[PDB]
Amino acid sequence: GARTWRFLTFGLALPSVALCTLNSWLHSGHRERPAFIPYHHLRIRTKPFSWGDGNHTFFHNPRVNPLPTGYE
Amino acid sequence: GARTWRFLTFGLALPSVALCTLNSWLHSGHRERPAFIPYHHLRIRTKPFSWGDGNHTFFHNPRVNPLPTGYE
Amino acid sequence: YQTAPFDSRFPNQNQTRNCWQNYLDFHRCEKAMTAKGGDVSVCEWYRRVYKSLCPISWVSTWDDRRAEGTFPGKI
Amino acid sequence: YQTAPFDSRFPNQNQTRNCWQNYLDFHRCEKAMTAKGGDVSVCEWYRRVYKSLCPISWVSTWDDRRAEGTFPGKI
Amino acid sequence: YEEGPGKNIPFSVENKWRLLAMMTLFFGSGFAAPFFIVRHQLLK
Amino acid sequence: QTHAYHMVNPSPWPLTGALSALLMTSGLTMWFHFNSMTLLMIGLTTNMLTMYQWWRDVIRESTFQGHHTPAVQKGLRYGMILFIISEVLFFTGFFWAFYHSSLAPTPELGGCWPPTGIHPLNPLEVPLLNTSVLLASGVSITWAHHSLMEGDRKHMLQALFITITLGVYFTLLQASEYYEAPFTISDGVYGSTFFVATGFHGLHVIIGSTFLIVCFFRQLKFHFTSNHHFGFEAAAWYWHFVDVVWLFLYVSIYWWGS
Amino acid sequence: MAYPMQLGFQDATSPIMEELLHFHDHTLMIVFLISSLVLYIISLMLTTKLTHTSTMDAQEVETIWTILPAIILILIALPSLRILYMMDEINNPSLTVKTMGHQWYWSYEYTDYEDLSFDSYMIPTSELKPGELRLLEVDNRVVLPMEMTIRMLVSSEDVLHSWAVPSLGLKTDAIPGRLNQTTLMSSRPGLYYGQCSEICGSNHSFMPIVLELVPLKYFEKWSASML
Amino acid sequence: MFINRWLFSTNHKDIGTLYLLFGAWAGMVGTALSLLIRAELGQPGTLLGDDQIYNVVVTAHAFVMIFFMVMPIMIGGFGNWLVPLMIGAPDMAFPRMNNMSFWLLPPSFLLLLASSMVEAGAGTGWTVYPPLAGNLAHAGASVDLTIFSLHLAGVSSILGAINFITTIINMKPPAMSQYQTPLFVWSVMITAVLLLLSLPVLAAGITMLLTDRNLNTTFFDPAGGGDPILYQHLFWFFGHPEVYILILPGFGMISHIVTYYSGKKEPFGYMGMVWAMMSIGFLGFIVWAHHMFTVGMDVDTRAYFTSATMIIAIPTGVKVFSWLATLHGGNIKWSPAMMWALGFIFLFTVGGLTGIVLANSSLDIVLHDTYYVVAHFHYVLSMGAVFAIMGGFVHWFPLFSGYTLNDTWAKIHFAIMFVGVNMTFFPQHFLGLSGMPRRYSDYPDAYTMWNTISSMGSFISLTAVMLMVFIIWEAFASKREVLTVDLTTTNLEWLNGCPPPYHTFEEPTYVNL
Amino acid sequence: FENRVAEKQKLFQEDNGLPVHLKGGATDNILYRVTMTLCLGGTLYSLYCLGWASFP
Ligand code: HEA
Ligand code: HEA
Ligand SMILES: CCCCC/C=C/C/C=C/C/C=C/C/C=C\CCCC(=O)O[C@H](COC(=O)CCCCCCCCCCCCCCCCC)COP(=O)(O)OCCN
Ligand SMILES: CCCCC/C=C\C/C=C/C/C=C\C/C=C\CCCC(=O)O[C@H](COC(=O)CCCCCCCCCCCCCCCCC)COP(=O)(O)OCCN
Ligand SMILES: CCCCCC/C=C/CCCCCCCCCC(=O)O[C@H](COC(=O)CCCCCCCCCCCCCCC)COP(=O)(O)OC[C@@H](O)CO
Ligand SMILES: CCCCCC/C=C\CCCCCCCCCC(=O)O[C@H](COC(=O)CCCCCCCCCCCCCCC)COP(=O)(O)OC[C@@H](O)CO
Ligand SMILES: CCCCCCCCCCO[C@@H]1O[C@H](CO)[C@@H](O[C@H]2O[C@H](CO)[C@@H](O)[C@H](O)[C@H]2O)[C@H](O)[C@H]1O
Ligand SMILES: C[C@H](CCC(=O)O)[C@H]1CC[C@H]2[C@@H]3[C@H](O)C[C@@H]4C[C@H](O)CC[C@]4(C)[C@H]3C[C@H](O)[C@]12C
Ligand code: CUA
Ligand SMILES: [O-][O-]
Ligand SMILES: [Cu+2]
Ligand SMILES: [Mg+2]
């Protein structure tokens, strides 16, 4: 019945979400970025991207995404 | 319907069994037994078995099951 | 050398595989060196680490099994 | 030594990992022998096998990347 | 909508010679296209 | 007619949809090669116009004109199941690519998975939260379904609102994840598999959320009866599909692949 | 090489190509027989004024139509798979040679002892010496010892190619990032020709393979001369 | 009114007519491309240019013949016309979605013809393997336009599959079980299940190729840890089912034609025919790597794919023997359609048998990427699929149009085409065994005689194609209106006259239990 | 909100001969003309772009 599925929604499902939200909001501080190494299997550029200067990924984050030549 | 599940029984299921029966029949024949090595993690005896002489497993096959002391 | 340093491969309370790996590494190295007729002294680090970490009865049992031909690790 | 023998670790038409493994094995062995100051002739088998199996351009690329600090295998 | 022979098609069959013209342009255009594409690539 | 099937009025939307496909594809070509977004934005516009008018007409034909007899409804049920199956097989291709790459890592990667230089996300942080979110939304959409069958307007709207909210929460969490990820789509086969598989999944979450929002507004306007609500059933089936694809991504890419 | 008006395979130069010839003769007999039976039965169905248009029972005849084909398939598969496993058998090669595919030529590496390597280009038609073969000659042939088991390793430095020598039963794809292995054993000295067997762009038709098979003593003199 | 009827259609018959017109046009394009191939090969040397222009022609030839000629004619054309009529249904389940399956194809075709007009075209093979199809070896828009062409064709067929499966399951008379539907209807349902499962995998694979070309992914690029061979697996996971998609509706039309012109009420062993088609559809999903016997897979894998591939001969042979047993005891009418169907049974068998030769991985080492493969697939496509299409066309033309063909002309057409395709393809067996590779603009001198003869055959086939257009013109020009056909008791599609009214089965059939 | 489905049923069942895509009134006509203008115009633009891209 609707009563049972509402009981599961508020008594189990949303409490789970609240606990995982608390878990996440406790491990949410920025990780220490690793030394840049210009590995040939990463930062692939076979064709320029069709936006910006051609060299930045779509959701480029300056803090954690280095370019082929290193961190900005 | 019954008609469809009989069609699956005779048209797919038993043909599969017939094909796997052929496969097994062709790859049958005694593979050669390996050199006996008295590994301490095998042929475990912490207590005699409650049948026979205490030292033979329940479906002991002399051809492929060595005793702690080697092949019979 | 004081004792075996922290090894990031084995960071947990269960150190069984640390003793085991260093025992294997020493005996693999010793075999590689004795074979070409090279110098077992290059194997020294593995020897010191396994002797530090491994219970005497484990090493003794493993040595007996290598001599018997029943050691189940690849050397 | 005529050529690399059959290796039961790599029994199939794809020999990529055979070349790779012997290249790693050579360079790990050469680092160990240089590290204690031991002798690189101990590493000779791995050298002959990878030189025999590996494309010149693969060896040359891997060599360049080791010198660059971008070689992705563990040595 | 019109129904029956020659009425259930997007082309007229009222006049067989107009039809011959339309069919000629239809199948001929398709057959010609690859020859003209090849000409186009060669003229580069 | 003395059959129960729907003879549909002649419609321009198949042609406008087909032309929107030409404009989107020619538009992607003109974006990737000739540095221009013009055709692509026309095609995206005509695609949204086509989908709006086509599904509006289906609402007109059913809620307003009564053409969805049980036989018509049975057909739509088969249609939606077959559509979902085709979408499962699309995802299967991306899972195959992932397992191919990850089970046999090549020397270029360091002969290991994850590759050398790849720092995966912690599957116990936001990816676990995203899992709790979509599982919770499967519970709330089930509450919505039962409320509708029991004739409860208020509780159907509350449960469906909660389902949509969770879909939006997943989407904002995943957008945030994407921005924070230290690896990109250009980080070899690890980035390729990660972003293309989770990216097509995120698109399906946005599609599924949009479908649920359509059902929410139709429910606000009293379109659904306690017995006749196939648009809601289809949206719920699609939403469960989206959840299950997430569980497979979570286990395969985030957890096993970390 | 192929000769004018050829109907079948190039003469076998390796024991495995001989096995394939015998296997093809077996399979082609069955193809001919089944093709002929179907044509004959068509003609038999079409050549009588006698009629039977009422419902016919299918059960009995469908036993024949499934069992006989299943037996024929087993009679093809048994020798087929025997040869498959023969061409995978452990042998101990005395020599390894690498070939790398390129747009549009092959390179060869003999790195067992020395670092010997060279490129192998098609002789243009305008440069052929009298009596030489259009599209098939190369400047630098693959010199190999006869009557010896050789390991050929195949890869590419660009797109896909495929390294083929029909008279030895050989075709191994050349894939960048992959090292594919085949075994080569020639029963005879001579020149053995093949052609690139994966579409690879502009000059796919024009990057042939020529093996030159010589006694070991001559192979050794040739290797020594390359120093 | 003309735009409402022909651009805004919700009618299964008019949409079937659009598909037949589309496929006939596509067939002229594919024929022209086939003649350019055989003109290049008709004498030793170079006619057009190097392998790039040549393989742009070969690639376009294959895409046009498969995606724009065979599938639109068999599934969109005969499927939309006949399926609803054969089950007494008033239309398809999704009559408006049906119209979008159709209208996606002209844009799909436009993208393919744009591929060939920009840069140097897509000279990739219809398989579009990387890295040749990647952004270094095929820089520029051509391959992306090919990919987009395949996306639109893919969506057309996936929606059409959903439509056919739903119509066939849901819209029969309530008394009619699946085991009371005609074999052509079974052949379309099974083809639609194959499309539904296979096309999404192709879509995933060519999408990965698109992203490797434009978004710096490395699915197929070893530099990123990718693998060109992964593309091959994804392509052929679609590509083997695709050839069963090409032939299954042809098997269904053959069953109807052989039954009809043998004067029989029913095909021999109906439940065997259903079993055989479902068996072929299932086995067709577990055999794809027989396209990859030279890429370097493990021996046990090659043994499995050899064995699984050969198993398809058993259900296929049940159909062949069942067609022969349908002729058995017939009052045979030697109509042009019957001639196409008899040609089919024999020539499809020959090509099927060369398929069984190729199934053997060991022998495939020598036959792979040779003209032996080309001979195999043209016997089953240019003589099987095409003969089924021609037999279906001459059998059902009077139903669709209301007019009769000239039977003597149609027999002349059959005779010319029979000589042309056999002269074209039979000698390609010799070229294959003697080692002539695929995708070559030129050949060593030894291969001259059989290439010359093959090219002469292609011209005979051109003469048959030209004659077919005349024959269709003569039928519409003369206007012989159909009065009656025999055997309507077992061929429901005829029972509403020729052509049937725009709306049929407004009052459904009466069928009791 | 109030249940106004009966009033939409009356509008969409009015015997006025309009097809369902135009039966809502003048706004349907506007949205149809916008859609078809963008589709036909965009298709003409795509053909132009092809002509341009077909030459250096
Ligand atoms: C249906 C598929 C199909 C059909 C019918 C054909 C028909 C023909 N093909 Fe084929 N071909 C392929 C599919 C097809 N082909 C594929 C998949 C390849 C491989 C591509 C690659 O390597 O990547 C290929 C490759 C191929 C090659 C090898 C190229 C090479 O490796 O370099 C050659 C060489 O001669 C060739 C020639 C021909 C010829 C002469 C015909 C002639 O027989 C054609 C004659 C004309 C017709 C058969 C009629 C067509 C029209 C209709 C049926 C419409 C009828 C109208 C109505 C019903 C109204 N084609
Ligand atoms: C309609 C199209 C179609 C059909 C139906 C088939 C059907 C079959 N094909 Fe084919 N095939 C192609 C189109 C088709 N093929 C194409 C286009 C390619 C090339 C793709 C590319 O690379 O471009 C190809 C390639 C291809 C290959 C890859 C070869 C290579 O590239 O090296 C193989 C390998 O096994 C194969 C096998 C088969 C087999 C076993 C069947 C079976 O389904 C045939 C079964 C039929 C019979 C066997 C005859 C009837 C049976 C009897 C009368 C009973 C008795 C018979 C026996 C006992 C044997 N074909
Ligand atoms: C937040 C939840 C999820 C959001 C979903 C995505 C948002 C934008 C685009 C939507 C379409 C998504 C579909 C999947 C396609 C490919 C890539 C999308 C995945 C994505 O968004 O990945 C991003 C890259 O996007 C890129 O390249 C840019 C991508 C934009 C252009 C893509 C063009 C390709 C379209 C292919 C169409 C094929 C359709 C197939 C139809 C099949 C029918 C048979 C990742 O960012 P990044 O900076 O590399 O790494 C993060 C570093 N901090
Ligand atoms: C084809 C399979 C059918 C099985 C029948 C075989 C034997 C009797 C019953 C079996 C019941 C199943 C499991 C019990 C445990 C062990 C038997 C496992 C299966 C078996 O039969 O194992 C054999 C050993 O049997 C032995 O020891 C035999 C030992 C016989 C004594 C069994 C002891 C019973 C255990 C107590 C049961 C507790 C039940 C718990 C109830 C839960 C309530 C909450 C294997 O033979 P082997 O020679 O070692 O190797 C083969 C070498 N060629
Ligand atoms: C803005 C965000 C950008 C993203 C753009 C991409 C697209 C997003 C689209 C979201 C989909 C919305 C679908 C709305 C459908 C509304 C019509 C509807 O739901 O119609 C119902 C029928 O269902 C039917 O046709 C069922 C129709 C099912 C449609 C299935 C939709 C899935 C679509 C996927 C789109 C392609 C994705 C592919 C990606 C690779 C009508 O019947 P009932 O509900 O019984 O009502 C009748 C009762 O009132 C009588 O009492
Ligand atoms: C790179 C970019 C290339 C992208 C190409 C995009 C291609 C085309 C543009 C798409 C335009 C879509 C416009 C909306 C289409 C809605 C179809 C629909 O909803 O169809 C319904 C049937 O399909 C059903 O239900 C269930 C099926 C619903 C299918 C929804 C349409 C999705 C289209 C995308 C398909 C993605 C394929 C993913 C699998 C790989 C209704 O059928 P009708 O015959 O209308 O009515 C019947 C009446 O009885 C209703 O009252
Ligand atoms: C109703 C149907 C719709 C009708 C179609 C509308 C037609 C649009 C006309 C404008 O065309 C645009 O012109 C831009 C400039 O004039 C181009 O910019 C691009 O090209 C420039 C060339 O100068 C470069 O700077 C850049 O690549 C970029 O700005 C762009 O490609 C192109 O679309
Ligand atoms: C206005 C309406 C009353 C029921 C009816 O129209 O008969 C009520 C019933 C359910 C309500 C919705 C549900 O309670 C869920 C949401 C609750 C949020 O706090 C506001 C928005 C929210 C989306 C509500 C808006 C509005 O108050 C709704 C839509
Ligand atoms: Cu190299 Cu083809
Ligand atoms: O594909 O045979
Ligand atoms: Cu196949
Ligand atoms: Mg190949």
Ligand code: NA
């Ligand atoms: Na030529």
